[PDB]
Amino acid sequence: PCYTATRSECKQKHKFVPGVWMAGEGMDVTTLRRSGSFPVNTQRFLRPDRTCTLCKNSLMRDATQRLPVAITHWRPHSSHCQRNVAAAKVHSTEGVAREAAANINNDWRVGLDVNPRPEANMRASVAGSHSKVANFAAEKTYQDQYNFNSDTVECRMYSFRLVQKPPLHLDFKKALRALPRNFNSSTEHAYHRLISSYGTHFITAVDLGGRISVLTALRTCQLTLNGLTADEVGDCLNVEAQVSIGAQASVSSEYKACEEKKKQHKMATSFHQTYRERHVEVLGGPLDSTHDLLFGNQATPEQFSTWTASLPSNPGLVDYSLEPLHTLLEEQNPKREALRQAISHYIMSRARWQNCSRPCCQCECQDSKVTNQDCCPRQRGLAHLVVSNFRAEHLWGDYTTATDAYLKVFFGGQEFRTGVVWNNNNPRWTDKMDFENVLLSTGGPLRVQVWDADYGWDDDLLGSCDRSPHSGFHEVTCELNHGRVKFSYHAKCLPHLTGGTCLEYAPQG
């Protein structure tokens, strides 16, 4: 929307249109990072006719500015203001409780009386009682709270393009002079010398404007694990035997003996991980809005208004379009071909492992204690417990006959039973017992209980064993009151976890 000026119009101090020098800049296509290279020279401002293109400045007083020849169409977009405010909140909870109790009581008593007629008497009495109490309890609370939001403001003001015949810069010409004839393995290094110094693509169409971006994340993860165990045993025995004779002669023997035993086991475990990230980017502004805009979650509209009012003087970067470098060479020139091949390969190289920030090169999933949004481990302490190779040695279960024994597995509030072989004093079983995902840390103590099936309302207990689960291919041996029981298990940690009880996170992130 402007024209060519004349000799007198092209005399006084006339600054260039804002942000024009950003045009034609090289940019890596791999990283989308501005290396700061200018394959094209935009310094010239006079056509061979010696006139210059003064162009009026909308949204900037009522003056005119200089248009360089390489520029196609400087459109002063009147006004375009966009805002995008996105938010997201996620909550997750999980709560489990197991409780178990067992009460057992038994009593015994006998009484005998003999009264022979010819001057004789006799009495006897016996008593006894047993009691066992067991209590298991466990609580498991998981809660995760994730939060995200992003506020972006854009204001497009300027935009313009280039042609396919712009004046190439002298330094780029000198680089081309030292550049070899065509492509080869030895000369490819020389191409690298060009690439990092001039990028792979150059800006052909550009749009100028101001921008704010504010990203904020907040990831919190809380684990609480509680476990209680309480055992009581009480055994009271009472014997009282008295014998008297018709002639004065008395004997009395009274026994009393009662044992009490208590066991308590409490274990609390708490994990808390909070990660907060903010990130703010600003491209427009003459170092003036920086006074208040960068800091503080809220910006008052007044300094924002001052920023926008001063914005036309200094533009930023909002959008760009890329043109391959080989487009800029001569139409009849072989060294176009041998050029881009290398770049193409080069691109793919940095696409594979040299630069892998965007594809995830599958990365880790944890915040790594710095940057790296990723994820806290949604499950911790879980293991795939597998119990196998049940065997026992030298039992004494059945008194008259051979031992009829069977085992019970108690873990994490779960009650599990096996098959019973008959009449064996050292049997073993081929059961492949699996627990799927269980918490070893707060599953309580693994109990293996050896019972003797005597077909009665009061079964005979050969014994029991308590062990603390740990990760690895472990073997467990237990000596009973009579006989012994041996077996093994392998409760491997779930991935991203290791250690004895599978709580600590092995890698950095």
Ligand X SMILES: *[C@@H]1O[C@H](CO)[C@@H](O)[C@H](O)[C@H]1NC(C)=O
Q: Nearest approach, Cβ of 32 to ligand X (angstroms)?
A: 33
Q: By CB under 6 A, what part of segment 174-203 binds ligand X?
A: 182, 184-187
Q: Nearest approach, Cβ of 426 to Ca ion (angstroms)?
A: 13
Does residue number 460 form part of the binding site for Ca ion (CB under 5 A)? Answer: yes
Q: Nearest approach, Cβ of 200 to ligand X (angstroms)?
A: 22
Q: By CB under 5 A, what part of segment 430-459 binds Ca ion?
A: 452-454
Distance CA 288, CA 282 (A): 12
Distances (CA, A) of 455 to 371, 404, 416, 452: 66, 10, 20, 9
| Residue closer to Ca ion (CB basis): 341 or 418 | 418
- Name the binder of 186 from Ca ion, ligand X, none, CB < 5-8 A by kind: ligand X
- Helix axis angle for 185-198 and 337-349, nearest 10°, is 80
* Residue 436 marked in a binding site: yes
Residues that contact ligand X, how many (by CB under 6 A): 5
Task: Tell me the one-letter amino acid at 242.
Answer: Q
- Name the binder of 184 from Ca ion, ligand X, none, CB < 5-8 A by kind: ligand X
Start-to-end Cα distance in the chain:
56
* Residue 458 marked in a binding site: yes
Structure tokens at 396: 């004494």
- Name the binder of 321 from Ca ion, ligand X, none, CB < 5-8 A by kind: none
- Name the binder of 401 from ligand X, Ca ion, none, CB < 5-8 A by kind: Ca ion
* Residue 87 marked in a binding site: no
C-alpha gyration radius of the chain:
43
Long-range contacts of 51-54 (CB under 8 A, 24+ apart): 51/4, 51/5, 51/6, 51/7, 51/10, 52/4, 52/5, 52/9, 52/10, 52/14, 53/2, 53/3, 53/4, 53/5, 54/2, 54/3, 54/5, 54/9, 54/10, 54/14
Q: Is 242 exposed, middle or buried (0-12, 13-18, 19+ CB in 10 A)?
A: middle
Question: Strand pairing of 382-393 and 484-490?
Answer: antiparallel
Distance CA 321, CA 153 (A): 21
Does residue number 401 form part of the binding site for Ca ion (CB under 5 A)? Answer: yes
Q: Nearest approach, Cβ of 179 to ligand X (angstroms)?
A: 12
Residues that contact Ca ion, how many (by CB under 5 A): 10
* Residue 459 marked in a binding site: yes
Q: By CB under 6 A, what part of segment 123-182 binds ligand X?
A: 182
The residues that touch ligand X, with contacts defined as CB under 6 A, are 182, 184-187
Question: Which segments are annotated as binding site?
Answer: 397-398, 401-402, 404, 423, 436, 452-454, 457-460
Question: Which segments are annotated as binding site for Ca(2+)?
Answer: 397-398, 401-402, 404, 423, 436, 452-454, 457-460
The residues that touch Ca ion, with contacts defined as CB under 5 A, are 397-398, 401-402, 404, 423, 452-454, 460
